[PDB]
RNA sequence: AUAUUGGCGAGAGACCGAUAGCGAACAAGUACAGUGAUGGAAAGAUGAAAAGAACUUUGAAAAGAGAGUGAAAAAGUACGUGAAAUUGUUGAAAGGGAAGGGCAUUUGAUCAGACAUGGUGUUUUGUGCCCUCUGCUCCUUGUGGGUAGGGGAAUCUCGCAU
RNA sequence: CGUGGAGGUCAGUGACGAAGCCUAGACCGUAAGGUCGGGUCGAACGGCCUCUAGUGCAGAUCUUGGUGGUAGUAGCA
């Protein structure tokens, strides 16, 4: 059934859990609403399951019906969610008619955060940044240490200046 | 996040008895088992022992000074589990992750609004 | 078999030093009688250093680089959200460079928007210092019209001189390479072309590898063919990178670690 | 400054360690010409190493190293008159025997300065 | 996958067998592939290597350089290609020990038994 | 072989005379027979574009505004024959700096914003040439019967231009574009007075972020028109282009105004330039103007250059076909050209002439010039004894 | 059919990994000790390749100094990583017949301390997955999905850019 | 809570530096300990659900190896 699916993954392995040091459990099954995993908040244990995701900029809301327990190929039925926030939350509501109030406000909540992930464009229009992360590979860290120490030794700067002051002020006497 | 004022109870490390005198005795905590030990009978002046009373408040446990819970991350997949808990949890880029992969992780965590506890690790300019 | 190996080669090393130098004591004794025999040894037997074994216009002067016609104004800026050590570093460049203005850089004005200001205000060069952590790491000289731009890396700064207000004399070393003399060209341009002789201050720019060292000194002349000099100013090591050719759009050299593999070349 | 320095080193030397420590620190921070003259005086019982003693063998090793470091300095092309030992260090060696490593680093004493109004 | 009971998949047995192999077995273990031109002519992938045949080096620091094999050092599992030489500090020349898997034969040295070896393996000289 | 290397730091033409296997970097290797500086006119008047007409005649175009017809003549100086260069005619003052300085109020990044020639090619055995500038000017400079250059007509285009490519596949028409300027097809009349914009490109649909895709095409090459049933109204012109935003974009006008396939060649939107056309086997597959002679995009193979140090090779579907001279090229690449279909001409800001073989990806010639190259043309490849 | 710590020859392991495992991974039943029967250890790792440091110079020798090979000698036949005890040097601090510890704090030294930059509500425009015209394609129930050719902002914030 | 190995899993980490070692460095856990920064290094390693054991040291006039104070002392006939 599904209670038997839950208990077998609650303990006895949900092989995509992250045990945080906080003791918290995170299902990384790409189709869950809360990143955390709990009973009927993870998409395997529950049979009726809604979620908002993004594949491109297009934010779809996927939906899982218990009708399709036989066929995993077409489990998640998906609908595009316009682009304006107000009509999208209204778009959400109609799909969630006669469900748990869990998925009602939580898909509303997924959509909220994933729309304010499109603050990426804000970072990437006003980018123009003169920095960029450079790796410091420990081979280079010694090619540019032990060769400078070998430079100074062979340099003999004092003798170089002592030459090119005498050689200057003899010719510029 | 609006968090409560995090009380620590005991900031000092619970070192072992005679960990400082002898060198072979480690600073890692071990109880004194002997009946004639002053530390075991909790005499005045002697070192304080770890007991359950020093336990941290449940609401403010595991929280760093920033008010976030710590969370290890290996790659971009494990990072994107905290898409819903940016205010609560913080990405701790694991020690063994290369400099090549960190620039990728930091790009995504900056976009998702996830506070990384250890940026500038292996990364010069 | 380490226990065998250890004794065999320790004795062989012991045997070799005896033989090496008994040959040399006989060499010494034959050299006392005949000076000429020593001379021939020095011809054949060579020290063979790395320098010995190295693996091998006028319109430009004005158009890309600043000459002795104006006082060159240098727009000293810093990378965004920098701390004490960067401004501490700016105070060392506030003395050495001719007519520096320090600009506190407040987020935005990407790069071309800066160029618009320093056309209007009429600057010659831009210099920007950056910090990854609490240490200074990179230094970027750009020329404001056209844009020949040089990037640099600092791995040394250590701090008893205390100099005067007199303007220091330039000196450069080892720029045989054409890419070397285009960097020599930058430091001829960017530093003052005033030298007031009295005040006795010398700024060097020695480059025996691909590493360039700049130092300041005080020279005292005694008439017995010798000059003395005391350490003054900042200790320094630089590394050339990029040569971005446009303001920042193009490249000419851009250091990779694909060099260091040659152990020679030196650009 | 490594440019203003020369250094000799002796390793696995069959000397008494405890005697070498005393004659090393007796000569530490001294000008090279005064230093070499001092050890000649210790050999002839004119001066003693700091209670005081005349340890012939230990001093013999040290003035051998100082003679070597003098030639090391003239190999690089340093001034002989302004030369002084800055860092002289002596520590034990693998063993019974009681051998010792010695290393000494000689340095220029740079003054040479003027000013103008 | 191993099907036979005669052959062993043990690491310890296999490494010993290789390092304590005789000169005759090491002849077969030091086999070089042929270039695409010779593979088209002779209709054969790889052969054991000898002296008076030419070779082109594919992998290593001496990449793309070619020459003629001087001596098959079977003890050190190596070939020594003439004109692929590292110059010592005293002005002398020391040959680099290349491995025949990294090499590629460009011009074979056909003898009578060599012709018979090609004809055995399904060749057409 | 013999080369015309356009120098900018001196503002001249250096003439390379050498053999195959010439290397100036190695002292024990082969040397070039003769280097020859000609027409030193300073940094202010460097040669932008050229065209080799015949054995004893070649046109030039300088950045001061001057288009010059120059006579080549050979004489003796083992057994090699050096060239002499004499300016016969000159048509000057063909730039308009006022347009470009007014438009780019921070377009991207250029402080001086110099106007240069984007093309120099023949219209058709004609004695009739065209020259286009970055400020949208097009000058139809015809060589007269008395061997003197005369300007027939000056024409106007929407700025800013970066490339202009004529269409010489009969089966007059050209195309042009630049920064925030789409690819527009313009028909010229035989009188050379009338220009008519017959077609304009459309930018593709938005990316993930719903941002507008940047438009900055850098070079175009034409293909022979699409086969099958030609639709009425819709024109038949197959062509591809390269942008500054890594987009290898391919347009079939029969299909539509939008390009049917935009392909990111490199990640992170790396700037690219100079779309050349070659063939994998080292063959000539193009006309005199480099336009690909086929009715399909899948046969096309392209060479393009970035601004870091690299020279790339790509097919018709954006698959990476290997770099050209990864080791030797240390600086940028200002100019590339596929000569004969079996040689590559290369020389950039590292100030070296490089001649690469197309088939084996092998460097043949390396010549130090001492000046930044912006243009190279091969006169002949006949060996010298 | 059964036994088998020997021999001959294999195939294996939820075994041990150099103070373990046989005593012995190596000049091991060797070196060595005992009149003798017997007793019986220690000891693995340079590198990818010796490329094992040429040559100048300090010393009768012992070792150094310049210089070089190598990715690295910060890998040198005392050779991978190189812990602690312990030893020297340098720097800082403390010391009138005890130090180290716990609670608290001052002073001195010192390290942390955002490539954080918006958010909201209006207004120019300019684009698109927007309006509109014409379509094409995957499948399951309406509350579907993907994907072309044109036009059009004088309506429309629907989104994103200024 | 930790250690050696086993099954499973994380399409885990890893020459853009695994393991180890230090560190007047930082965080978490009452604690067993865990995590991270810096330095050194050079090739494998870890979390999670389970299995298994030659699994956790301050002592045994402990075993082995190394190193001190004693001491430049007694001493060298």
mmCIF file of N, CA and C in Angstrom, chain D residues 13-92:
data_model
loop_
_atom_site.group_PDB
_atom_site.id
_atom_site.type_symbol
_atom_site.label_atom_id
_atom_site.label_comp_id
_atom_site.label_asym_id
_atom_site.label_seq_id
_atom_site.Cartn_x
_atom_site.Cartn_y
_atom_site.Cartn_z
ATOM 1 N N UNK D 13 79.666 15.163 13.219
ATOM 2 C CA UNK D 13 81.032 15.416 13.673
ATOM 3 C C UNK D 13 81.311 14.755 15.014
ATOM 4 N N UNK D 14 82.380 13.959 15.050
ATOM 5 C CA UNK D 14 82.808 13.258 16.261
ATOM 6 C C UNK D 14 83.494 14.224 17.234
ATOM 7 N N UNK D 15 82.664 15.063 17.850
ATOM 8 C CA UNK D 15 83.068 15.989 18.907
ATOM 9 C C UNK D 15 82.191 15.701 20.116
ATOM 10 N N UNK D 16 82.660 16.124 21.288
ATOM 11 C CA UNK D 16 81.820 16.230 22.473
ATOM 12 C C UNK D 16 80.785 17.320 22.215
ATOM 13 N N UNK D 17 79.510 16.982 22.399
ATOM 14 C CA UNK D 17 78.418 17.927 22.171
ATOM 15 C C UNK D 17 78.413 19.060 23.197
ATOM 16 N N UNK D 18 78.507 18.691 24.475
ATOM 17 C CA UNK D 18 78.410 19.632 25.596
ATOM 18 C C UNK D 18 79.503 20.698 25.612
ATOM 19 N N UNK D 19 80.688 20.352 25.108
ATOM 20 C CA UNK D 19 81.784 21.312 24.944
ATOM 21 C C UNK D 19 81.537 22.261 23.774
ATOM 22 N N UNK D 20 80.952 21.726 22.700
ATOM 23 C CA UNK D 20 80.680 22.487 21.478
ATOM 24 C C UNK D 20 79.623 23.573 21.702
ATOM 25 N N UNK D 21 78.615 23.268 22.527
ATOM 26 C CA UNK D 21 77.558 24.223 22.887
ATOM 27 C C UNK D 21 78.130 25.479 23.549
ATOM 28 N N UNK D 22 79.095 25.277 24.444
ATOM 29 C CA UNK D 22 79.725 26.363 25.191
ATOM 30 C C UNK D 22 80.594 27.250 24.298
ATOM 31 N N UNK D 23 81.436 26.627 23.470
ATOM 32 C CA UNK D 23 82.324 27.362 22.551
ATOM 33 C C UNK D 23 81.592 28.010 21.360
ATOM 34 N N UNK D 24 80.379 27.536 21.073
ATOM 35 C CA UNK D 24 79.523 28.157 20.065
ATOM 36 C C UNK D 24 78.923 29.457 20.593
ATOM 37 N N UNK D 25 78.307 29.399 21.775
ATOM 38 C CA UNK D 25 77.686 30.579 22.385
ATOM 39 C C UNK D 25 78.682 31.602 22.937
ATOM 40 N N UNK D 26 79.926 31.164 23.132
ATOM 41 C CA UNK D 26 81.029 32.052 23.501
ATOM 42 C C UNK D 26 81.407 32.986 22.351
ATOM 43 N N UNK D 27 81.201 32.516 21.121
ATOM 44 C CA UNK D 27 81.600 33.245 19.916
ATOM 45 C C UNK D 27 80.423 33.915 19.174
ATOM 46 N N UNK D 28 79.209 33.718 19.690
ATOM 47 C CA UNK D 28 77.981 34.220 19.066
ATOM 48 C C UNK D 28 77.869 35.746 19.113
ATOM 49 N N UNK D 29 77.569 36.339 17.957
ATOM 50 C CA UNK D 29 77.385 37.791 17.834
ATOM 51 C C UNK D 29 78.658 38.614 17.706
ATOM 52 N N UNK D 30 79.771 37.946 17.400
ATOM 53 C CA UNK D 30 81.088 38.580 17.315
ATOM 54 C C UNK D 30 81.520 38.835 15.877
ATOM 55 N N UNK D 31 82.312 39.892 15.674
ATOM 56 C CA UNK D 31 82.960 40.177 14.384
ATOM 57 C C UNK D 31 83.981 39.094 14.062
ATOM 58 N N UNK D 32 84.040 38.709 12.786
ATOM 59 C CA UNK D 32 84.788 37.537 12.318
ATOM 60 C C UNK D 32 86.291 37.605 12.592
ATOM 61 N N UNK D 33 86.869 38.788 12.398
ATOM 62 C CA UNK D 33 88.298 39.031 12.636
ATOM 63 C C UNK D 33 88.672 38.944 14.128
ATOM 64 N N UNK D 34 87.792 39.460 14.988
ATOM 65 C CA UNK D 34 87.945 39.376 16.445
ATOM 66 C C UNK D 34 87.700 37.948 16.939
ATOM 67 N N UNK D 35 86.753 37.269 16.287
ATOM 68 C CA UNK D 35 86.348 35.898 16.605
ATOM 69 C C UNK D 35 87.457 34.874 16.364
ATOM 70 N N UNK D 36 88.084 34.947 15.187
ATOM 71 C CA UNK D 36 89.168 34.035 14.803
ATOM 72 C C UNK D 36 90.428 34.256 15.646
ATOM 73 N N UNK D 37 90.690 35.522 15.985
ATOM 74 C CA UNK D 37 91.802 35.904 16.857
ATOM 75 C C UNK D 37 91.603 35.395 18.288
ATOM 76 N N UNK D 38 90.350 35.405 18.750
ATOM 77 C CA UNK D 38 89.963 34.905 20.076
ATOM 78 C C UNK D 38 90.242 33.409 20.248
ATOM 79 N N UNK D 39 89.936 32.625 19.216
ATOM 80 C CA UNK D 39 90.112 31.172 19.262
ATOM 81 C C UNK D 39 91.577 30.743 19.187
ATOM 82 N N UNK D 40 92.398 31.574 18.543
ATOM 83 C CA UNK D 40 93.852 31.426 18.562
ATOM 84 C C UNK D 40 94.405 31.638 19.973
ATOM 85 N N UNK D 41 93.803 32.583 20.698
ATOM 86 C CA UNK D 41 94.168 32.895 22.080
ATOM 87 C C UNK D 41 93.723 31.813 23.063
ATOM 88 N N UNK D 42 92.615 31.134 22.753
ATOM 89 C CA UNK D 42 92.122 29.997 23.557
ATOM 90 C C UNK D 42 93.055 28.780 23.411
ATOM 91 N N UNK D 43 93.547 28.557 22.188
ATOM 92 C CA UNK D 43 94.536 27.510 21.899
ATOM 93 C C UNK D 43 95.876 27.699 22.623
ATOM 94 N N UNK D 44 96.261 28.957 22.844
ATOM 95 C CA UNK D 44 97.531 29.302 23.497
ATOM 96 C C UNK D 44 97.367 29.700 24.971
ATOM 97 N N UNK D 45 96.190 29.398 25.527
ATOM 98 C CA UNK D 45 95.845 29.618 26.946
ATOM 99 C C UNK D 45 95.948 31.090 27.397
ATOM 100 N N UNK D 46 95.668 32.005 26.465
ATOM 101 C CA UNK D 46 95.644 33.446 26.735
ATOM 102 C C UNK D 46 94.278 33.864 27.277
ATOM 103 N N UNK D 47 93.219 33.381 26.624
ATOM 104 C CA UNK D 47 91.835 33.546 27.084
ATOM 105 C C UNK D 47 91.170 32.181 27.211
ATOM 106 N N UNK D 48 90.104 32.113 28.007
ATOM 107 C CA UNK D 48 89.353 30.872 28.188
ATOM 108 C C UNK D 48 87.882 31.011 27.781
ATOM 109 N N UNK D 49 87.267 29.880 27.437
ATOM 110 C CA UNK D 49 85.850 29.816 27.064
ATOM 111 C C UNK D 49 84.978 29.847 28.330
ATOM 112 N N UNK D 50 83.988 30.766 28.384
ATOM 113 C CA UNK D 50 83.043 30.754 29.505
ATOM 114 C C UNK D 50 82.051 29.587 29.415
ATOM 115 N N UNK D 51 83.834 30.103 36.360
ATOM 116 C CA UNK D 51 84.331 28.896 35.694
ATOM 117 C C UNK D 51 84.662 29.152 34.230
ATOM 118 N N UNK D 52 85.782 28.580 33.783
ATOM 119 C CA UNK D 52 86.245 28.660 32.391
ATOM 120 C C UNK D 52 87.278 27.572 32.080
ATOM 121 N N UNK D 53 87.306 27.138 30.819
ATOM 122 C CA UNK D 53 88.205 26.072 30.365
ATOM 123 C C UNK D 53 88.804 26.379 28.984
ATOM 124 N N UNK D 54 89.826 25.608 28.618
ATOM 125 C CA UNK D 54 90.482 25.691 27.324
ATOM 126 C C UNK D 54 90.242 24.385 26.545
ATOM 127 N N UNK D 55 89.088 24.282 25.844
ATOM 128 C CA UNK D 55 88.786 23.064 25.093
ATOM 129 C C UNK D 55 89.357 23.116 23.671
ATOM 130 N N UNK D 56 90.500 22.459 23.477
ATOM 131 C CA UNK D 56 91.255 22.512 22.219
ATOM 132 C C UNK D 56 90.520 21.901 21.024
ATOM 133 N N UNK D 57 89.962 20.701 21.215
ATOM 134 C CA UNK D 57 89.319 19.925 20.143
ATOM 135 C C UNK D 57 88.046 20.576 19.599
ATOM 136 N N UNK D 58 87.176 21.032 20.501
ATOM 137 C CA UNK D 58 85.914 21.675 20.125
ATOM 138 C C UNK D 58 86.133 22.969 19.357
ATOM 139 N N UNK D 59 87.074 23.781 19.838
ATOM 140 C CA UNK D 59 87.450 25.048 19.200
ATOM 141 C C UNK D 59 88.059 24.808 17.809
ATOM 142 N N UNK D 60 88.847 23.738 17.699
ATOM 143 C CA UNK D 60 89.475 23.309 16.444
ATOM 144 C C UNK D 60 88.447 23.054 15.329
ATOM 145 N N UNK D 61 87.324 22.424 15.686
ATOM 146 C CA UNK D 61 86.194 22.215 14.770
ATOM 147 C C UNK D 61 85.510 23.526 14.371
ATOM 148 N N UNK D 62 85.347 24.425 15.344
ATOM 149 C CA UNK D 62 84.626 25.694 15.162
ATOM 150 C C UNK D 62 85.407 26.677 14.273
ATOM 151 N N UNK D 63 86.708 26.842 14.530
ATOM 152 C CA UNK D 63 87.558 27.722 13.703
ATOM 153 C C UNK D 63 87.798 27.175 12.291
ATOM 154 N N UNK D 64 87.652 25.855 12.134
ATOM 155 C CA UNK D 64 87.635 25.197 10.825
ATOM 156 C C UNK D 64 86.417 25.599 10.010
ATOM 157 N N UNK D 65 85.258 25.614 10.672
ATOM 158 C CA UNK D 65 83.994 26.082 10.095
ATOM 159 C C UNK D 65 83.995 27.577 9.789
ATOM 160 N N UNK D 66 84.579 28.370 10.689
ATOM 161 C CA UNK D 66 84.673 29.823 10.521
ATOM 162 C C UNK D 66 85.602 30.214 9.371
ATOM 163 N N UNK D 67 86.681 29.449 9.198
ATOM 164 C CA UNK D 67 87.598 29.597 8.065
ATOM 165 C C UNK D 67 86.879 29.259 6.755
ATOM 166 N N UNK D 68 86.048 28.215 6.800
ATOM 167 C CA UNK D 68 85.207 27.785 5.680
ATOM 168 C C UNK D 68 84.153 28.841 5.319
ATOM 169 N N UNK D 69 83.465 29.371 6.332
ATOM 170 C CA UNK D 69 82.443 30.408 6.151
ATOM 171 C C UNK D 69 83.019 31.724 5.638
ATOM 172 N N UNK D 70 84.272 32.003 6.003
ATOM 173 C CA UNK D 70 85.014 33.157 5.490
ATOM 174 C C UNK D 70 85.257 33.031 3.987
ATOM 175 N N UNK D 71 85.627 31.823 3.545
ATOM 176 C CA UNK D 71 85.838 31.527 2.125
ATOM 177 C C UNK D 71 84.522 31.437 1.347
ATOM 178 N N UNK D 72 83.448 31.033 2.035
ATOM 179 C CA UNK D 72 82.093 31.021 1.471
ATOM 180 C C UNK D 72 81.603 32.439 1.178
ATOM 181 N N UNK D 73 81.930 33.369 2.083
ATOM 182 C CA UNK D 73 81.591 34.784 1.940
ATOM 183 C C UNK D 73 82.356 35.436 0.790
ATOM 184 N N UNK D 74 83.634 35.083 0.655
ATOM 185 C CA UNK D 74 84.484 35.592 -0.425
ATOM 186 C C UNK D 74 84.209 34.907 -1.770
ATOM 187 N N UNK D 75 83.534 33.755 -1.725
ATOM 188 C CA UNK D 75 83.020 33.088 -2.923
ATOM 189 C C UNK D 75 81.840 33.867 -3.511
ATOM 190 N N UNK D 76 80.923 34.293 -2.637
ATOM 191 C CA UNK D 76 79.793 35.150 -3.015
ATOM 192 C C UNK D 76 80.240 36.572 -3.351
ATOM 193 N N UNK D 77 81.271 37.050 -2.654
ATOM 194 C CA UNK D 77 81.805 38.396 -2.858
ATOM 195 C C UNK D 77 81.317 39.385 -1.818
ATOM 196 N N UNK D 78 81.471 39.011 -0.549
ATOM 197 C CA UNK D 78 81.147 39.874 0.586
ATOM 198 C C UNK D 78 82.397 40.593 1.089
ATOM 199 N N UNK D 79 82.182 41.627 1.904
ATOM 200 C CA UNK D 79 83.256 42.307 2.623
ATOM 201 C C UNK D 79 83.713 41.445 3.804
ATOM 202 N N UNK D 80 85.030 41.347 3.980
ATOM 203 C CA UNK D 80 85.629 40.540 5.047
ATOM 204 C C UNK D 80 85.671 41.261 6.396
ATOM 205 N N UNK D 81 85.903 42.575 6.362
ATOM 206 C CA UNK D 81 86.098 43.388 7.574
ATOM 207 C C UNK D 81 84.824 43.624 8.388
ATOM 208 N N UNK D 82 83.691 43.761 7.698
ATOM 209 C CA UNK D 82 82.398 44.034 8.339
ATOM 210 C C UNK D 82 81.604 42.758 8.674
ATOM 211 N N UNK D 83 82.261 41.606 8.542
ATOM 212 C CA UNK D 83 81.619 40.302 8.700
ATOM 213 C C UNK D 83 81.505 39.889 10.165
ATOM 214 N N UNK D 84 80.327 39.386 10.536
ATOM 215 C CA UNK D 84 80.061 38.888 11.888
ATOM 216 C C UNK D 84 79.125 37.680 11.878
ATOM 217 N N UNK D 85 79.368 36.735 12.785
ATOM 218 C CA UNK D 85 78.482 35.578 12.966
ATOM 219 C C UNK D 85 77.178 36.013 13.650
ATOM 220 N N UNK D 86 76.061 35.786 12.964
ATOM 221 C CA UNK D 86 74.742 36.154 13.476
ATOM 222 C C UNK D 86 74.048 34.964 14.144
ATOM 223 N N UNK D 87 73.986 33.845 13.423
ATOM 224 C CA UNK D 87 73.320 32.640 13.893
ATOM 225 C C UNK D 87 74.283 31.460 13.889
ATOM 226 N N UNK D 88 74.720 31.059 15.080
ATOM 227 C CA UNK D 88 75.476 29.818 15.264
ATOM 228 C C UNK D 88 74.685 28.868 16.172
ATOM 229 N N UNK D 89 74.508 27.642 15.685
ATOM 230 C CA UNK D 89 73.586 26.669 16.258
ATOM 231 C C UNK D 89 74.234 25.290 16.270
ATOM 232 N N UNK D 90 74.090 24.584 17.387
ATOM 233 C CA UNK D 90 74.683 23.253 17.559
ATOM 234 C C UNK D 90 73.702 22.304 18.259
ATOM 235 N N UNK D 91 73.407 21.181 17.605
ATOM 236 C CA UNK D 91 72.501 20.156 18.147
ATOM 237 C C UNK D 91 72.997 18.733 17.890
ATOM 238 N N UNK D 92 72.495 17.798 18.698
ATOM 239 C CA UNK D 92 72.969 16.406 18.738
ATOM 240 C C UNK D 92 72.738 15.633 17.434
#
